[PDB]
Every structure is written in structure tokens, then in C-alpha cells.
């Protein structure tokens, strides 16, 4: 099945998931000079004060920090979005080296990693139904670069030892995702897809301009995770990113000048 290896990586995904070559695939390169300021975009509303994290899971391609999305507790609205989108999970993509790891790029620049906070449109009732709709999901993407430590990430880093291998999960309550946001909410937005199979074209992408900084020790612990299950040969979980896909008939809008 699909992964990020030489024989099952992004260049092979189209064989099982033909939409891999579709008209609104993600991620993409963000050409900053071509993105147009759109004054009709509203400010983004990130309301995570009542967020309820539950669990952290190594699913064999990343780790997801999962939230209780059975009520409006952590929601995204405004910006390009109509209606209310509930936080279901966040995860990261990252590299084997600091010079790569992000899925989106900015004028071809790759960051060390990229955070995805995944939200689904409540008008569709559940996540399974939402992914079947062109406006079913809103993903907030945040770049990571390596420098000073991010304090609000440390809690995540320190639980990774307990979910080293595929299929392992651990209780992860009372985590506050506000600790992962940069200072500025300036963003680019465009219509796109999930960046993992099934690659459904159901996402409004909201990519923040300002990266967060994490420490070399922080990213080094992320790179100790495994793609494999326990008792299987160790393959380090690194370079779990899909490269940039053709923009085709899409415009990237900026929230800022």
C-alpha cells in the first residue's frame, strides 16, 4: 500500500488514486509575487479556547493529535470560509534534513516541516460526509523552521517515545493548540486537496505566511518515530511529505498586502 518509500511514494499514488493527477491537487508552490491581495477576504477566526484534545496516534504515515469534534469546541471560521469548521486533528509533515519537509513551498523554498490543523464543515454532519464535498474541509497550514524551541510543542515531543511505531496511541488530553500558532494570522488561500490518499479535492487551504520556530532537539525527536509497526524492521518516519503539484486553473489569494 501507499507510503513515502522508493516503491510506494508520491509518484506511484496515481495508480491506486487517479485523482492524484486531478485539477485541484495539493500541496502547491506559493509564488508570492503572483498571489493577489484580495480585500474581500475577512479576518480569520481561530477559536480554540474550548478545545478538547483526546489522543495521539502513530498511523504509520504521521502522528495525529485528535480532538473531540462532537460539539463546536475548537472552530475555524471567517477568512475565505463560509460557515463553521470544527477541528478534528492536527499532524505534521517533516524531513530527514532541515532543508526539506514542508509540503507547500514559498517561492520554491522548502521549510523543515509543516503543521496541518484539519477542520470539517459542520453543515455536512461528519468528517466522512465532508470529505465528499468541494468545501468539506479547511486545513490551516503552518510552516516550521529550525531555531529557538517552541514551548507549546514540547508536550507533543515528549509523548512520541510512547507511540514510536505504527498503530500505537496514547492518551493526550488537555493539550492547547493555541501554543502552536505564530503571532500573525496573515495567510494565502486556494482550493485544493488532501495531500495523502485518497487525495480528495475537498479542501480550502489556508497557509499562514509566518512560520513558527522549533528547536533542533525538537525536530530530532520527531525524526525518531517509525513508519513500521513494533517488531518489524526499523524504518525512520522522515520525509513524509508530498511534493508540490501543478497549480493548473487556480489563483492563490493573499489576505495581506
Show which residues are catalytic.
Answer: 61
# residues contacting Zn ion (CB under 5 A): 1
Compute the distance between CA of residue 108 and CA of residue 30 in angstroms, rounded to an integer: 8
The distance of closest approach from Cβ of residue 46 to Zn ion in the complex, given in angstroms and rounded to an integer, is 18
Shortest-Cβ-distance residue relative to Zn ion = 116
In terms of CB distance, is 1 or 36 closer to Zn ion?
1
Q: Is 104 in the site for Zn ion (CB under 5 A)?
A: no
| Cα distances (angstroms) measured from residue 40 to each of 30, 37, 84, 190, 255 | 20, 9, 18, 14, 9
The angle at the Cα of 94, spanning 252 to 199, to the nearest 5 degrees, equals 55
Q: Is 7 annotated as a binding residue?
A: no
The distance of closest approach from Cβ of residue 91 to Zn ion in the complex, given in angstroms and rounded to an integer, is 6
In terms of CB distance, is 84 or 196 closer to Zn ion?
196
Mask: binding to Zn ion, 49-78, rule CB under 5 A, as x and -?
------------------------------
List the beta bridge partners of residue 121: 85
Q: In the numeric block, which cell numbers belong to residue 65?
A: 493529535
In terms of CB distance, is 33 or 89 closer to Zn ion?
89
Spell out a b/e string for 217-241, using b for 16 or more CB atoms within 10 Å of the CB, else e: ebbeebbebbbbeeeeeeeebbbbb
Contact 43, 79 (CB under 8 A): yes
The three-class DSSP label of residue 127 is: helix
Mask: binding to Zn ion, 110-139, rule CB under 5 A, as x and -?
------x-----------------------
Q: Which stretch binds Zn ion (CB under 5 A): 8-16, 46-54, 109-117, 170-178?
A: 109-117
The distance of closest approach from Cβ of residue 118 to Zn ion in the complex, given in angstroms and rounded to an integer, is 7
Q: Which residues contact 31 (CB under 8 A, 6 or more apart)?
A: 107, 252
Taking Cα atoms as reference points, which of 110, 109, 121, 54 lies closest to residue 85? 121
The distance of closest approach from Cβ of residue 218 to Zn ion in the complex, given in angstroms and rounded to an integer, is 18
Compute the distance between CA of residue 55 and CA of residue 238 in angstroms, rounded to an integer: 22
Contact 189, 204 (CB under 8 A): yes
Q: Is 33 annotated as a binding residue?
A: no
Compute the distance between CA of residue 137 and CA of residue 92 in angstroms, rounded to an integer: 17
The distance of closest approach from Cβ of residue 179 to Zn ion in the complex, given in angstroms and rounded to an integer, is 19
Q: Is 34 annotated as a binding residue?
A: no
Q: Is 122 annotated as a binding residue?
A: no
In terms of CB distance, is 81 or 113 closer to Zn ion?
113
Q: Is 165 annotated as a binding residue?
A: no
Q: Which stretch binds Zn ion (CB under 5 A): 20-28, 64-72, 108-116, 174-182?
A: 108-116
State the residues that interact with Zn ion by CB under 5 A: 116
- What residues are designated binding site? 91, 93, 116, 195-196
- What residues are designated binding site for Zn(2+)? 91, 93, 116
Amino acid at each position: 500500500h501507499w507510503g513515502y518509500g522508493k516503491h510506494n511514494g508520491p509518484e506511484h499514488w496515481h495508480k491506486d488514486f487517479p485523482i492524484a493527477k486531478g485539477e485541484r491537487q495539493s500541496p502547491v508552490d506559493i509564488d508570492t509575487h503572483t498571489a493577489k491581495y484580495d480585500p474581500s477576504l475577512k479576518p480569520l477566526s481561530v477559536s480554540y479556547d474550548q478545545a478538547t484534545s483526546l489522543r495521539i496516534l502513530n498511523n504509520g504515515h504521521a502522528f495525529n493529535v485528535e480532538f473531540d469534534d462532537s460539539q463546536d469546541k475548537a472552530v475555524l471560521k471567517g477568512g475565505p470560509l463560509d460557515g463553521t469548521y470544527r477541528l478534528i486533528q492536527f499532524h505534521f509533515h517533516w524531513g530527514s534534513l532541515d532543508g526539506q519537509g514542508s509540503e507547500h513551498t514559498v517561492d520554491k523554498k522548502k521549510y523543515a516541516a509543516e503543521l496541518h490543523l484539519v477542520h470539517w464543515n459542520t453543515k455536512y454532519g461528519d468528517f466522512g460526509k465532508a470529505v465528499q464535498q468541494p468545501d468539506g474541509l479547511a486545513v490551516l497550514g503552518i510552516f516550521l523552521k529550525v531555531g529557538s524551541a517552541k514551548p507549546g510543542l514540547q508536550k507533543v515531543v515528549d509523548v512520541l517515545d510512547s507511540i514510536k511505531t505504527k498503530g500505537k496511541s496514547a492518551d493526550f488530553t488537555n493539550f492547547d493548540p493555541r501554543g502552536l500558532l505564530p503571532e500573525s494570522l496573515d495567510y494565502w488561500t486556494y482550493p485544493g486537496s488532501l495531500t495523502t490518499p485518497p487525495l480528495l479535492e475537498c479542501v480550502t487551504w489556508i497557509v499562514l505566511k509566518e512560520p513558527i520556530s522549533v528547536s533542533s532537539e525538537q525536530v530530532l525527536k520527531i525524526r525518531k518515530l517509525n513508519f513500521n509497526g513494533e517488531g518489524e524492521p526499523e524504518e525512520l518516519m522522515v520525509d513524509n511529505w508530498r511534493p508540490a503539484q501543478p497549480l493548473k486553473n487556480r489563483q492563490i489569494k493573499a489576505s495581506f498586502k
